[PDB]
Coordinates of C-alpha atoms and ligand atoms in Angstrom, one line a residue:
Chain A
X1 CA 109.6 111.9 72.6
X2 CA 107.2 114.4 73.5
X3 CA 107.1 115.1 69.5
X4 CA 103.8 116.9 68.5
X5 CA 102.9 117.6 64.8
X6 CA 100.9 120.5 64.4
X7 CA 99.2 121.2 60.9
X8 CA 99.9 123.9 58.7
X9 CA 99.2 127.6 58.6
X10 CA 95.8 128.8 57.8
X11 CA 94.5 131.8 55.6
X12 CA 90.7 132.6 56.2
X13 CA 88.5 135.8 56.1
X14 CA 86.4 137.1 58.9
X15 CA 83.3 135.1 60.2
X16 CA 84.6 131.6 59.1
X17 CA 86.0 128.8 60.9
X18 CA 89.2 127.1 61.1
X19 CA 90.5 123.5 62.8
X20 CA 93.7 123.4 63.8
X21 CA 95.3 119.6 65.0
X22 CA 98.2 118.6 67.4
X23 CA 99.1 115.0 66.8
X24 CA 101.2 113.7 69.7
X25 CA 103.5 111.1 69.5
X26 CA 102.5 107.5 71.2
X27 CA 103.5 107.3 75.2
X28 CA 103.5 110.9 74.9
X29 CA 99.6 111.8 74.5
X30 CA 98.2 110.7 78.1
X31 CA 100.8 111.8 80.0
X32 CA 100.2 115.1 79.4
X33 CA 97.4 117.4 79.2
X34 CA 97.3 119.6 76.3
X35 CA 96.8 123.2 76.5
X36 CA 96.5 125.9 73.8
X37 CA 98.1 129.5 74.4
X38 CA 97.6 132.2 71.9
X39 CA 100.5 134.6 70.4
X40 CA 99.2 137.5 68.7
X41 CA 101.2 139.5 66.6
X42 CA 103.9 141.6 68.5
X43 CA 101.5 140.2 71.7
X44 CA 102.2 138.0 74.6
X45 CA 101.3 135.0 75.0
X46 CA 97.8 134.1 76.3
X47 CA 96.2 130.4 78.0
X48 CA 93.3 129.7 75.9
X49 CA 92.9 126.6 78.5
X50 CA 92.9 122.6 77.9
X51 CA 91.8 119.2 77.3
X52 CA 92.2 116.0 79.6
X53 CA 93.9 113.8 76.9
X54 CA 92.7 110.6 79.2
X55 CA 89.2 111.8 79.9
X56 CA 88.4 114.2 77.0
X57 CA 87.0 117.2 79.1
X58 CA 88.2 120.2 77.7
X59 CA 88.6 123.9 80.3
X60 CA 88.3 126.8 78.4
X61 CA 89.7 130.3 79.6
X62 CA 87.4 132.6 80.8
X63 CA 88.6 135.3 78.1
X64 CA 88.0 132.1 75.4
X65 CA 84.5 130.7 75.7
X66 CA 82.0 130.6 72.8
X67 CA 83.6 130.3 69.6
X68 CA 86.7 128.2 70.2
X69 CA 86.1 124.1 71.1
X70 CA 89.0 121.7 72.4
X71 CA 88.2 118.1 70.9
X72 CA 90.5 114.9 70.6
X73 CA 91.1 112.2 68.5
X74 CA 92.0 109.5 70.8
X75 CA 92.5 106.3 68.0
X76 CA 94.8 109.1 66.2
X77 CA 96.4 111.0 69.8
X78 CA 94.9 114.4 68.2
X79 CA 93.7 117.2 69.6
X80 CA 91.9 119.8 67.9
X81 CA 91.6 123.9 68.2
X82 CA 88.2 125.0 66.8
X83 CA 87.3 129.0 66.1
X84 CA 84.1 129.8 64.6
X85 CA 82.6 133.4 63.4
X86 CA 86.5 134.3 63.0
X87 CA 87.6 137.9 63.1
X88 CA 90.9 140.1 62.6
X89 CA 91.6 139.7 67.0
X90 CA 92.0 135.7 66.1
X91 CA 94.6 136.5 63.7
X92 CA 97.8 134.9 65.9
X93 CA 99.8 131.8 66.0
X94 CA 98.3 129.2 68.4
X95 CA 100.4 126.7 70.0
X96 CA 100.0 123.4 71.4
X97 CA 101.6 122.6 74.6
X98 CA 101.8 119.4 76.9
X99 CA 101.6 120.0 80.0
X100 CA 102.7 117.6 83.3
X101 CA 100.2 117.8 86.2
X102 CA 102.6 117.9 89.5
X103 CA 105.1 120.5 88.7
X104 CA 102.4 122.8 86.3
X105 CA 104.7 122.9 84.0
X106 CA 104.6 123.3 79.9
X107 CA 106.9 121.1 79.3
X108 CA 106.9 120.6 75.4
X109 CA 105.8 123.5 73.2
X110 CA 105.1 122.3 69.9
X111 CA 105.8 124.2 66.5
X112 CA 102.9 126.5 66.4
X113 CA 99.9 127.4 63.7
X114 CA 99.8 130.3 62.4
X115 CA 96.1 132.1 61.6
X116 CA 95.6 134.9 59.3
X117 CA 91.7 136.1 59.2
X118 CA 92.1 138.6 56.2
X119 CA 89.4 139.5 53.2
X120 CA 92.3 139.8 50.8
X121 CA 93.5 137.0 48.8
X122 CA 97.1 135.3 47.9
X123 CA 99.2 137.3 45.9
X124 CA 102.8 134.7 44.9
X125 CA 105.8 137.1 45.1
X126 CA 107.9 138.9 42.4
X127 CA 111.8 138.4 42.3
X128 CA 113.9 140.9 41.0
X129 CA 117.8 140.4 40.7
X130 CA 119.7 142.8 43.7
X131 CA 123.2 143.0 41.1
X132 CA 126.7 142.8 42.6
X133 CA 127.7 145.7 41.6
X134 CA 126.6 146.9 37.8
X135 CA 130.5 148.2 37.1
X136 CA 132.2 146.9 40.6
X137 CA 133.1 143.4 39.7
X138 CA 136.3 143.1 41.7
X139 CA 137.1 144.2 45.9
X140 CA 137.3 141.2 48.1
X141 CA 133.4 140.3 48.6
X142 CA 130.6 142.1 46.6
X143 CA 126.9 142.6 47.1
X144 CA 124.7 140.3 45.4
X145 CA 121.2 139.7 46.5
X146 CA 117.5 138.9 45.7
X147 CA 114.4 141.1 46.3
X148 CA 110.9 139.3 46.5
X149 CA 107.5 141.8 46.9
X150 CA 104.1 142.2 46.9
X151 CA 103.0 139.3 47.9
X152 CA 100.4 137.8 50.9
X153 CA 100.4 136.3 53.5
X154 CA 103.5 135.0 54.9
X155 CA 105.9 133.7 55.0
X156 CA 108.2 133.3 52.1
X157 CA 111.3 130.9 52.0
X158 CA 114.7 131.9 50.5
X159 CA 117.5 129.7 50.2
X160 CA 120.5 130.2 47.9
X161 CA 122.0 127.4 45.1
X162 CA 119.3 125.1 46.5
X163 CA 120.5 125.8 50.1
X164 CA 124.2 125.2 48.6
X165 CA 124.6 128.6 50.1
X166 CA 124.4 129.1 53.5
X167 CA 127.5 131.3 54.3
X168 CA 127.1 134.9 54.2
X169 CA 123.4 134.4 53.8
X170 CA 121.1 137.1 55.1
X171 CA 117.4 136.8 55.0
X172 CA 115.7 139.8 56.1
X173 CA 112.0 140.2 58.2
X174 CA 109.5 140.7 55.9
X175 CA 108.1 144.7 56.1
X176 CA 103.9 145.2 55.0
X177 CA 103.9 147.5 52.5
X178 CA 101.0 150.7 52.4
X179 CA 99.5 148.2 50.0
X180 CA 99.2 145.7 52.4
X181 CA 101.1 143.2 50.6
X182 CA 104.5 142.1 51.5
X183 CA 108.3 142.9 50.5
X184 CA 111.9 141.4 52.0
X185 CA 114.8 141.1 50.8
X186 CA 118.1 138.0 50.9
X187 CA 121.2 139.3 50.6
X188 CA 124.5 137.0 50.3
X189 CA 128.1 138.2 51.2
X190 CA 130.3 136.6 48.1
X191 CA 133.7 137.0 47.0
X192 CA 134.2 139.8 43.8
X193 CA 136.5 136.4 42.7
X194 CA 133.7 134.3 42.2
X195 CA 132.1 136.6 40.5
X196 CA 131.7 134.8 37.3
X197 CA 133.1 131.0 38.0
X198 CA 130.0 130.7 40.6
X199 CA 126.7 130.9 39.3
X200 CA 124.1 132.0 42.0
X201 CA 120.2 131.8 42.0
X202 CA 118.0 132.6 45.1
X203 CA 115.1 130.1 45.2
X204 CA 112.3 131.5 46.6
X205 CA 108.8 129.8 47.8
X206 CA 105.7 131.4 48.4
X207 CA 102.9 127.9 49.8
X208 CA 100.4 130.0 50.4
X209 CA 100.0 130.6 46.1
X210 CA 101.9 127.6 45.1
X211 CA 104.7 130.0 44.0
X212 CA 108.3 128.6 43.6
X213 CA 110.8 130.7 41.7
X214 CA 114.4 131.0 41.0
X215 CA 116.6 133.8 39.4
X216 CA 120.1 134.3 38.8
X217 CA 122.0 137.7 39.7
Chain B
X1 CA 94.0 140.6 86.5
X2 CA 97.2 138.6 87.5
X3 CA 100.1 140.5 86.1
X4 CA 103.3 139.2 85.9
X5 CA 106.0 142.3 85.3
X6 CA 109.7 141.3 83.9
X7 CA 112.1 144.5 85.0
X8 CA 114.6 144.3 82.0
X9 CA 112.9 144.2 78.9
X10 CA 116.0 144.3 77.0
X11 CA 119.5 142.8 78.6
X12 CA 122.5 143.2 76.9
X13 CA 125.2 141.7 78.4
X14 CA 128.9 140.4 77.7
X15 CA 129.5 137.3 76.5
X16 CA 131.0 135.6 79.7
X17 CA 129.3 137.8 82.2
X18 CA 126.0 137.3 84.7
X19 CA 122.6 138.3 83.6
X20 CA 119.6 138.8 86.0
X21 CA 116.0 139.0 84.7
X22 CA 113.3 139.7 87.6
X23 CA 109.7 138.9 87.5
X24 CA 106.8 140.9 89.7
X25 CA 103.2 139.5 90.0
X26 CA 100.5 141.0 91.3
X27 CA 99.6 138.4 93.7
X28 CA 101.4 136.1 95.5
X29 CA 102.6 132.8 94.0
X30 CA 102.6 131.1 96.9
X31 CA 100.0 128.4 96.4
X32 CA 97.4 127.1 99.8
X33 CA 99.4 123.8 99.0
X34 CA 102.8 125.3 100.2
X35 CA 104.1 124.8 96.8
X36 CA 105.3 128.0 94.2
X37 CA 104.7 127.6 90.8
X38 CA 106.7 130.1 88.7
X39 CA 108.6 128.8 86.2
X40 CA 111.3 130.3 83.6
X41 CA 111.0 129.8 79.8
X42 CA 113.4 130.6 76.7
X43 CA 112.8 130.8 73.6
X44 CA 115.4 130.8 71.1
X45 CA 115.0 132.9 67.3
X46 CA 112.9 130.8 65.0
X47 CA 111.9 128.6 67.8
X48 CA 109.5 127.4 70.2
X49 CA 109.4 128.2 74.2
X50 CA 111.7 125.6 76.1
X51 CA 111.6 125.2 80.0
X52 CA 114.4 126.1 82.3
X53 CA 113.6 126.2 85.7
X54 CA 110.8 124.8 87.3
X55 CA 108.9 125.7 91.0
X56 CA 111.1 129.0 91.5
X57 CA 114.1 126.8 91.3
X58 CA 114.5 123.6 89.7
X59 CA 116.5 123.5 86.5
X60 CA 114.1 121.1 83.8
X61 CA 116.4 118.1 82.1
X62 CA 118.9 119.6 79.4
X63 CA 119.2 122.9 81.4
X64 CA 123.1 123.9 82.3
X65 CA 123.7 124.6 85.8
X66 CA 124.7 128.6 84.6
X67 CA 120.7 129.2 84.6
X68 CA 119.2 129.6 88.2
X69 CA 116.3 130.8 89.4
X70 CA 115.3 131.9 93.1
X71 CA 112.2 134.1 94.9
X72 CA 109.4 134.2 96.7
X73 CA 105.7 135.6 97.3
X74 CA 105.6 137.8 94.3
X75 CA 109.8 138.7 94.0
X76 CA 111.5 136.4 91.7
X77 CA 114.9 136.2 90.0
X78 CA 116.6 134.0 87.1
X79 CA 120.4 134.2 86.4
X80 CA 122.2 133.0 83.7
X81 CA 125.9 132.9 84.6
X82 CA 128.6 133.3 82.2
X83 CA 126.7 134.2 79.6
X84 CA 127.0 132.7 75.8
X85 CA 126.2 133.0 72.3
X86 CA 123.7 129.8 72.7
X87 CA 121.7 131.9 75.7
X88 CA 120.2 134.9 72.8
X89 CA 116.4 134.6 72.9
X90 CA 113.4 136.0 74.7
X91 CA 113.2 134.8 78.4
X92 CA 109.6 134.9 80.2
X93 CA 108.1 133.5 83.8
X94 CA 105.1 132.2 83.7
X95 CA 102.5 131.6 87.1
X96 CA 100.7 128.4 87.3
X97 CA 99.4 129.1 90.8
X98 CA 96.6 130.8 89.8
X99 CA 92.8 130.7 88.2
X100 CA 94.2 130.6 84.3
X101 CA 97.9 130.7 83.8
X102 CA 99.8 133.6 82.7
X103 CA 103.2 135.0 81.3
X104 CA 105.5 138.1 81.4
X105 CA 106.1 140.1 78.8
X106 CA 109.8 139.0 77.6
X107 CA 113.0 140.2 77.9
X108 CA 115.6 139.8 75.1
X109 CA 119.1 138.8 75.6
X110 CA 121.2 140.6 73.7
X111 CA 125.4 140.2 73.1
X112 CA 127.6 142.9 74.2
X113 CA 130.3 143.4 71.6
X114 CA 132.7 145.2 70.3
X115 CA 131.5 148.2 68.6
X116 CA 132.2 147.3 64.1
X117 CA 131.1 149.5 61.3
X118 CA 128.6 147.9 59.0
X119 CA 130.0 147.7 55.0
X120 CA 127.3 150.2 53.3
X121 CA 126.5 148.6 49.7
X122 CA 123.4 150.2 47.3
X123 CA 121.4 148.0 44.6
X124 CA 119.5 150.4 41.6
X125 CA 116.2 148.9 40.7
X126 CA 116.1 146.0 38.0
X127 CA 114.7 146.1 34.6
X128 CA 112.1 143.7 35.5
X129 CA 111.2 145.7 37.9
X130 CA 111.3 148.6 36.4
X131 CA 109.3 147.6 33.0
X132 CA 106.7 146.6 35.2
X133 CA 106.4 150.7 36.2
X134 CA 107.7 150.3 40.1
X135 CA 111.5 151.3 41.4
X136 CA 113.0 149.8 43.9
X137 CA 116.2 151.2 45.9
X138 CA 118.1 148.9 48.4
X139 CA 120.0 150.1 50.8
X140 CA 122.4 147.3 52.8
X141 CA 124.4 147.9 56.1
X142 CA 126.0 145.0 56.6
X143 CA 127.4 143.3 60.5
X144 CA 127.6 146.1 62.3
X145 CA 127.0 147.0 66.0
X146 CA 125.6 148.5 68.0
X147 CA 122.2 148.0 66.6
X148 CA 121.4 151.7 66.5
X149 CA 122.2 152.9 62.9
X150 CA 120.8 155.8 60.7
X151 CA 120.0 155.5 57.1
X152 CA 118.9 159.0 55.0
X153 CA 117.8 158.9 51.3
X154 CA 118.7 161.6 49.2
X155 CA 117.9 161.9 45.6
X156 CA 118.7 164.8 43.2
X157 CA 120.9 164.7 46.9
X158 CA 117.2 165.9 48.8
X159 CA 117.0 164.0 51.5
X160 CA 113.7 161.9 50.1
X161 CA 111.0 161.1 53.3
X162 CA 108.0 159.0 53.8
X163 CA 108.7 156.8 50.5
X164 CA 111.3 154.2 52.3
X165 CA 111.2 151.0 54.6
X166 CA 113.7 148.7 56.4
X167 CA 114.5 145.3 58.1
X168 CA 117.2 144.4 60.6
X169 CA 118.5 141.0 61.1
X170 CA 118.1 139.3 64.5
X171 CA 122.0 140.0 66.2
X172 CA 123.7 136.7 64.3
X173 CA 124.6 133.8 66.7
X174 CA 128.4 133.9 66.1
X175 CA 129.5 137.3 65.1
X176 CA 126.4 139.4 67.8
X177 CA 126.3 141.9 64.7
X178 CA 123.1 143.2 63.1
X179 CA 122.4 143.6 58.9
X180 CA 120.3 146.2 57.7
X181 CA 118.2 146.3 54.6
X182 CA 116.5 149.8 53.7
X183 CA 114.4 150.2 50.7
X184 CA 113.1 153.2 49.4
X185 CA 110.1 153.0 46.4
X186 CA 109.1 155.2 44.0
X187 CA 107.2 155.2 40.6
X188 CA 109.1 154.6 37.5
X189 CA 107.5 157.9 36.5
X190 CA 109.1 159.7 39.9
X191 CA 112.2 157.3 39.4
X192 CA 112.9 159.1 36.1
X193 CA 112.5 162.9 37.3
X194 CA 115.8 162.4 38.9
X195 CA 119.2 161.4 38.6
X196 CA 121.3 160.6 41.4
X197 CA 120.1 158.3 44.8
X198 CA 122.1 157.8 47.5
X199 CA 121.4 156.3 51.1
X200 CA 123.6 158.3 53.6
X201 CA 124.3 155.8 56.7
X202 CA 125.6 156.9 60.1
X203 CA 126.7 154.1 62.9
X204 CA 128.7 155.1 65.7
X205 CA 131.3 152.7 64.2
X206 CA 131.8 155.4 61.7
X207 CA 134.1 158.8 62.6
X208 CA 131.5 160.8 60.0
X209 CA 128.2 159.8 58.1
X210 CA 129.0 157.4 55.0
X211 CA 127.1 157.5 52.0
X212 CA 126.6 155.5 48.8
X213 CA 124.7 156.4 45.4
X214 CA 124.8 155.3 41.9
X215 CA 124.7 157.0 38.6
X216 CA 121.8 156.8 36.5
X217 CA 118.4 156.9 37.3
Ligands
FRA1 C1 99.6 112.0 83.7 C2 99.5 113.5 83.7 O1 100.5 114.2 83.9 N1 98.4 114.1 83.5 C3 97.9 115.5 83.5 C4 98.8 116.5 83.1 C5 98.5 117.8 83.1 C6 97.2 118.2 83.5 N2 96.9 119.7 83.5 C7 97.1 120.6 82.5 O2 97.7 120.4 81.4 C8 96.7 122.0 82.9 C9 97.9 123.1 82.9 C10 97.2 124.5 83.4 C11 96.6 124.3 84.7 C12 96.7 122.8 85.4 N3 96.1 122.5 86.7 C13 94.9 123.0 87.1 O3 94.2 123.9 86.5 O4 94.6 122.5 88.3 C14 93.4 122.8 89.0 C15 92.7 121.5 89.2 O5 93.0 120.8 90.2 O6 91.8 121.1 88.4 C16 98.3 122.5 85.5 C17 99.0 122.7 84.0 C18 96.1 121.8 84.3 C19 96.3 120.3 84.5 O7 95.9 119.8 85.6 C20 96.3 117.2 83.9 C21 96.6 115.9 83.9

């Protein structure tokens, strides 16, 4: 299986402390040793180090000792990724990888966590209609889109007709905004035809607020 | 500091045609047990790393025979032969030989293709939007290739600066196009001041810049 199931993005501000758990599947977890490596946004990756899954002795990078601890759950086949005193640098999405001991290899990468260390606070998303056309209702295929702004952190999810929609379909990267919040947009390529017989809605999600809108264009 | 230094950043290539990506490190590879380990990872958009080739090179379980690695000392070489749509990611060695492991910087894969226009479309800002006191003009150039493309706001047709943003796709896994969103924001106070916006795009798909602009404002 190799499976891991890494828990869920985090949202703290400087000088706290997160936990982040790797559960690995059974006859997976001590036949591998499981390593963190950091990813930074727009950064390489980095090896934070490891934990013996059989013994429970955790190695620490040299560029990673004093706030972050490796410690496991054995009953549960966890492993955990401590950082204390947090700061901005932390801000990255760790991953969990098992590793096999004779070839040195990473041979199962698992999701990843993200980590935002930020003093601001969730802001759920706006979305305004992107109108096919205001007086352009007919020519093949036609605009039609949804907007979503100022909000924090990421990510957002956008699906279209309750992921009815999948053709066409064109979610762009989110873009931080001077106010520090974020914007994107989800545009869906449609033909000027249905334009009337087919109702569309964007559904958007926002986890880190709770926010979960839809809106028809 | 062990650096490992991947040549091509970027790789575009043909669909069907060989691709070489070469990795550098600072010190040899070579381990006192005889035994190299450099290995090849991909990872694919939205996705986690995935081995490929293993000790210079052995090709990990579920890895075609097109990818190939070879090398020595501190020279080292993947190739991807006849390369496909499936192959688009970012492709990194990593060195296990050595105190804590590390990994090049990337390179992206990316399609050759034909070159196509993109299909300019332009979305006024909504009421909701704009009865909240913010305007928001979108901008869409949509499939097109190559990736370099141009987009100029003008309003009251004066090429508008510093007040506009934009997102492009990651190339699409069946077409190799890119989709570009631009949006430029203003205040509904400044949005009034004026009458006609238009977003003037230029792509070398196009024989002479195209624009698009609506009415009101
Ligand atoms: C059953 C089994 O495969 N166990 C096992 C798997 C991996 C590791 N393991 C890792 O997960 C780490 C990564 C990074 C470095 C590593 N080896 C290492 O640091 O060796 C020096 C040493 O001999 O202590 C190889 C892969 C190190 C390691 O030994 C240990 C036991």
């Amino acid at each position: 299986q190799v499976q891991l199931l890494e828990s869920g993005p985090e949202l703290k501000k400087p000088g706290e402390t997160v936990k982040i758990s790797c559960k690995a599947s059974g006859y997976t977890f001590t036949n591998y040793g499981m390593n963190w490596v950091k990813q930074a946004p727009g950064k390489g990756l980095k090896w934070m180090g490891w934990i013996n899954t059989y013994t429970g002795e955790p190695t620490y990078a040299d560029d990673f000792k004093g706030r972050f601890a490796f410690s496991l759950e054995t009953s549960a086949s966890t492993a955990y990724l401590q950082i204390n005193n947090l700061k901005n640098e932390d801000t990255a999405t760790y991953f969990c990888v098992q590793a096999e001991r004779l070839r040195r290899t990473f041979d199962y990468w698992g999701a990843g966590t993200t980590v935002t260390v930020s003093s601001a606070s969730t802001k759920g998303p706006s979305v305004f209609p992107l109108a096919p056309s205001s007086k352009s209702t007919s020519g093949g295929t036609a605009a039609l889109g949804c907007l979503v702004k100022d909000y924090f952190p990421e990510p957002v999810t956008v699906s279209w007709n309750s992921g009815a929609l999948t053709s066409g379909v064109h979610t762009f990267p989110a873009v931080l905004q001077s106010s520090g919040l974020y914007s994107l947009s989800s545009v869906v390529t449609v033909p000027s035809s249905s334009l009337g017989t087919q109702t569309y809605i964007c559904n958007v999600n926002h986890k880190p607020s709770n926010t979960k809108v839809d809106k028809k264009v | 500091e062990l650096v490992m230094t991947q040549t091509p950043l970027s790789l575009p290539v043909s669909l069907g045609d060989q691709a070489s990506i070469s990795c550098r490190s600072s010190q040899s590879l070579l381990h006192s047990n005889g035994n190299t380990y450099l290995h090849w990872y991909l990872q694919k958009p939205g996705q986690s790393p995935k081995l490929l080739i293993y000790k210079v090179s052995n090709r990990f379980s579920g890895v075609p025979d097109r990818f190939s690695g070879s090398g020595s000392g501190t020279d080292f070489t993947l190739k991807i032969s006849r390369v496909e749509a499936e192959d688009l990611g970012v492709y990194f060695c990593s060195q296990v030989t050595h105190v804590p492991p590390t990994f090049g910087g990337g390179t992206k894969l990316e399609i050759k293709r034909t070159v196509a226009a993109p299909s300019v479309f332009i979305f006024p800002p909504s009421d909701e939007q704009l009865k909240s006191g913010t305007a928001s003009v979108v901008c869409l150039l949509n499939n097109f290739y190559p990736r370099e493309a141009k987009v100029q706001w003008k309003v009251d047709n004066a090429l508008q600066s510093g007040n506009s943003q934009e997102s492009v796709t990651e190339q699409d896994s069946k077409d190799s196009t890119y989709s570009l969103s631009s949006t430029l924001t203003l205040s509904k106070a400044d949005y009034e001041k004026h009458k006609v916006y238009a977003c003037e795009v230029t792509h070398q798909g196009l024989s002479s810049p195209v624009t698009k602009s609506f009415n009101r404002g």
